[PDB]
């Protein structure tokens, strides 16, 4: 079932993040210059650029912190596209940042990948 595959995609990302593997984490995202990440106030695009940004921001794997997603809803839009709405939580040394996310996931090459990710706090 697609919802199960979509759930596993996000579970895999939590697990990769939580073992400090940015390369594995990035496998949840569409590997394309069109990949669109939206933050609180800005747009950025591209998978290479996004991977580079995480490496820049987290030179030490211990700095990633512990990630958990709480999925509020998965809505199938077609056999090839779904929207995923949830909260994210990070447990850090001196804080516990929280926020929300909304994702478009699409079936590309028989795999579900995140093609647009709007995360805010």
């Amino acid at each position: 079932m697609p919802t199960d595959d979509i759930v596993q995609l996000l579970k895999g990302q939590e697990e990769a993040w939580n073992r400090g593997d940015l390369d594995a984490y990035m496998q949840g995202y569409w590997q394309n210059e069109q990949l669109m990440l939206i933050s609180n106030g800005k747009f950025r695009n591209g998978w290479d650029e996004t991977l580079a940004a995480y490496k820049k921001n987290y030179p030490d794997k211990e700095s990633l912190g512990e990630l958990k997603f709480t999925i509020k809803e998965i809505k199938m839009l077609s056999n090839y596209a779904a929207m995923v709405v949830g909260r994210w939580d990070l447990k850090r040394l001196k804080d516990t940042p929280t926020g929300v996310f909304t994702l478009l996931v699409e079936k590309i090459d028989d795999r579900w990948v995140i093609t647009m990710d709007h995360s805010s706090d």
Copy 2:
């Protein structure tokens, strides 16, 4: 063409907002308890609840300010669903708030309506 209808939906909302007509503005959104609006950090649902919230926040039509959307991308996902990514701008008496939005629009009853709206700044 659906992209033209989606563009017009957002143009109609600008126009309604800019003449102080919240009821007309709300016609851009799916009229359902499932309507999902995501802000920087929180979820809210429902069309009635959203209309009530705008009326609460903007008791005076002059307080709405001038709204403009700048659409960055419309992506058709199927004949029934599209994602819309853009910036919003408001011109107010003493400031000019800006931010980003990502929307799911869906063809429901042969009309394009916003069913999920994640707006942040």
